[PDB]
């Protein structure tokens, strides 16, 4: 499978999540995603084929994970935007007020702005600290998906938000949306990963 930010993958033939970013760890290929998407060793599938398993994760507390893929996967420095792509150029962290977009299997490609940093989400499982808040909308299934600037700087992976009864926060005004992502920097250093760029 071609690994692109934003595409769907399933975990143990049950839940669905979205790919974050293609990364490498020495010769091993992988992608970063959300911790709440699977437990260590869960099996990730892309279009019905096995692509890898969860190598590590932290959830709750943080919300992060990396899946190590088999050798046959093709890692790409891109994030889906409809039929087009956003090239990943790096991981400079943008500041409050910067515009940002996110890509995921449920709501596609949505943009908005970063409204706050260091936010805590109280999930049923426990608190998740240090999240950055943006107002791009997100829906159930978007978790783990890419958060990136139009200029190609990777910001993080989708964690959660105030989804309404329709499964998303796209039907409420930007001013009332709280869509949270986990910062990419600490995931890259914690696992010793390098981003695939182009």
């Amino acid at each position: 499978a071609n690994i692109v930010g934003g595409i769907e993958y399933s975990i143990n033939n049950a839940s669905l999540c979205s790919v974050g970013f293609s990364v490498t760890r020495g010769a091993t290929k992988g992608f970063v995603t959300a911790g709440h998407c699977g437990t260590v060793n869960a099996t990730a599938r892309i279009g019905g084929a096995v692509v890898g398993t969860f190598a590590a994760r932290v959830f709750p507390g943080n919300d992060r994970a990396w899946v190590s893929l088999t050798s046959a996967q093709t890692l790409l420095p891109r994030v889906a935007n409809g039929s087009s792509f956003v090239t990943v150029r790096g991981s400079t962290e943008a500041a409050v007020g910067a515009a940002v977009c996110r890509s995921g299997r449920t709501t596609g490609y949505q943009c908005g702005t970063i409204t706050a940093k260091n936010v805590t989400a109280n999930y049923a499982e426990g608190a998740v600290r240090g999240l950055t808040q943006g107002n791009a909308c997100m829906g159930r299934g978007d978790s783990g998906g890419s958060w990136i600037t139009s200029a190609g700087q990777a910001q993080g992976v989708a964690s959660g938000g105030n989804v309404q009864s329709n499964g998303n926060n796209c039907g409420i005004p930007a001013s009332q949306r709280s869509s949270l992502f986990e910062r990419l920097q600490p995931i890259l250093s914690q696992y010793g990963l390098s981003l695939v760029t182009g």
């Binding site: 709440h36 919300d63 999930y123 829906g139 299934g141 959660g160 938000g161 105030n162 989804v163």
Partner: peptide, 4 residues
């Protein structure tokens, strides 16, 4: 908020 909820996870996703």
């Amino acid at each position: 908020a909820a996870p996703v």
